[PDB]
Amino acid sequence: YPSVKLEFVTVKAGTDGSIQTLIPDNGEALTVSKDRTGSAISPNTSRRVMSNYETLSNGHTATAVIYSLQSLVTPTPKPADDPTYRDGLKHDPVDVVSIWLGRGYLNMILNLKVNGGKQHVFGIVEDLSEFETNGTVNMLLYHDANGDEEYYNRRAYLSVPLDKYADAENPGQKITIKFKYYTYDKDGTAIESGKYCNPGFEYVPD
Ligand SMILES: [Cl-]
Ligand SMILES: [Cl-]
Numbered sequence: 001y002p003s004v005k006l007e008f009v010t011v012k013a014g015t016d017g018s019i020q021t022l023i024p025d026n027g028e029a030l031t032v033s034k035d036r037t038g039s040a041i042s043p044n045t046s047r048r049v050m051s052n053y054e055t056l057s058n059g060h061t062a063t064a065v066i067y068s069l070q071s072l073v074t075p076t077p078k079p080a081d082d083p084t085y086r087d088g089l090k091h092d093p094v095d096v097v098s099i100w101l102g103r104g105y106l107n108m109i110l111n112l113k114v115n116g117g118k119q120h121v122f123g124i125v126e127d128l129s130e131f132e133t134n135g136t137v138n139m140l141l142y143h144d145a146n147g148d149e150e151y152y153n154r155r156a157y158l159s160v161p162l163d164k165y166a167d168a169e170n171p172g173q174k175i176t177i178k179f180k181y182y183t184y185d186k187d188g189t190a191i192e193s194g195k196y197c198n199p200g201f202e203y204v205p206d
């Protein structure tokens with residue numbers, strides 16, 4: 001478990017790139033009264049990030065004080081035939097710590113065994129073969145450790161966007177996300193886990 005408690009949030013920058021707004025997943029948008037990180041994103045943009053922050057209230061209105069900010073991976077689900085997967089599908093093992101639907105994303109905290117100097121590349125391999133049949137979206141985690149040794153535990157944060165499944169001309173549509181990922185079994189063998197496929201994550205994009 002990490003030293004600093006981190007939450008999935010959205011941050012917005014104003015004209016100078018400084019963070020002016022923090023939008024918790026659980027609450028309403030808050031004006032950032034103080035950004036102790038001194039972070040700067042692209043002027044007038046929003047980013048889905050990890051943050052340590054606190055809410056301060058005067059009993060009527062509250063503001064956010066940011067203590068830490070870090071990026072998270074926002075992989076767009078893509079079919080196995082997409083050019084990003086040209087060099088083959090990679091499924092280096094991970095553990096799922098926590099996984100849930102929230103604020104238009106499929107959020108997850110992963111546990112990895114890393115070392116250093118190698119970029120861990122994440123993606124979502126999309127299969128829509130059952131989407132017209134029963135609204136099922138099949139997702140397989142892509143993970144390329146790039147030969148990084150499995151020495152130290154490290155968390156990874158993913159927020160899979162689900163906006164592409166919303167149909168404005170088909171409202172009230174119930175979508176079922178069935179997420180698969182490779183992990184180690186009790187004996188240290190890498191296996192494809194269907195743990196989060198039964199019954200899957202049901203949601204109505206509205
Ligand atoms: Cl982002
Ligand atoms: Cl106050």
Ligand SMILES: [Cl-]
Nearest residue numbers: 096097098099
């Ligand atoms: Cl769990």
Ligand SMILES: [Cl-]
Nearest residue numbers: 072073156157
């Ligand atoms: Cl990450």
